[PDB]
Each structure stands twice: as C-alpha cells, then as structure tokens.
Amino acid sequence: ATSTKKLHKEPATLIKAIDGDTVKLMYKGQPMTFRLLLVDTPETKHPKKGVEKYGPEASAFTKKMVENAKKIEVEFDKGQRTDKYGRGLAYIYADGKMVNEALVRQGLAKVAYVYKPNNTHEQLLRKSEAQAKKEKLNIW
Q1: CATH tag, 1-140
Q2: Which subcellular locations apply to this protein (predicted)?
Q3: Which single residue of 9, 51, 54, 107 could bond 47 by disulfide (Cβ 3.0 to 4.6 Å)?
Q4: DSSP run (H or E) holding 62
C-alpha cells in the first residue's frame, strides 16, 4: 500500500544461438555468450540417427523459447556472475518465463553445480529439479 517495485531485472535479445545452455544475448548493445546457469546440458556433439535420446530436443527447446519469445530476460547470480571464459551466469527468460526452469522442469536439463553466493533462483529450480526427478518426466 505504498511501494511494490521490489527487485529489478534487465531484458535482452538473442544475438545468435550457440548450442543448448549456451546462447548469445544482447548485453550493453553488444553480443555476449550466456549460459543456462545451474543447468545441465546434454554434453553431446552430433551422434548418428540413434544413440542418446536427448540432445537436439534439449538444445532446440532452449532456443525455441528464446526465439519464440518476443522478449528475453537474463538474471546474473550474486557470486561470480562470470566464469573463466567470462560466460553469462544467468537464467534466460522467454515471454516472461525463465527458460532454464522450463528445461529443468520439463526434463531436457537438470539442476547441477550451484551454491552461494549463487542462489538467485535456487529455491525456484530446487523444486523444478527434484519435482520432475521424482516423477522422471521426460528424459529422466
């Protein structure tokens, strides 16, 4: 009943899709490499028609949301926010929804390697990960 403008995020656009968790986003009028923070990637390359049920679907999906989403949003962590390669340690949103949570909640990806000072969406992904895990949604 006085102020409801807590927090603050910054939007961005997909300059070019890399693979899955990795994607190029528009930051400061420049193209930066962003990564699906605390998200697990198929870790594949290009297997034949068979072998490994996951891969394209996981990489495509991530790009599907951002590409289909008229607007993308990224949220950097509270710790490093950038690894050795200076990658983008943030979650990529699409149409107002964090794509990371999608893959994590769907099954394409999973929550791995995450902790303070990194925990912007820990409680958010914590459930999305374990929730889909217990039921083994897709690819689990």
Answers
A1: 2.40.50.90
A2: Secreted
A3: 51
A4: helix 56-68
Out of 67, 81, 87, 122, pick the active-site residue.
87
Beta strands in 13-135 (DSSP E): 14-17, 22-27, 30-36, 72-76, 88-94, 97-98
Tokens 């939007």, located at residue:
11
Q: In the structure encoding, which two tokens stand for residue 66, read together? A: 């951002």
Question: For residue 27, which of 72, 79, 83 has the smallest C-alpha distance?
Answer: 72
What gap in Å lies between CA 136 and CA 140, rounded to an integer? 5
Cα–Cα distance between 137 and 96 in angstroms, integer? 23
CB 4 within 8 A of CB 92: no
- 39-51 per-residue burial string, b: 16 or more CB within 10 A, e: under 16: bbbbeeeeeeeee
Q: Active-site residue 35, yes or no?
A: yes
Three-state SS at 88: strand
Give the tokens for residue 3.
């102020």
Active-site residue, from 35, 57, 73, 101: 35
87 catalytic residue (yes or no): yes
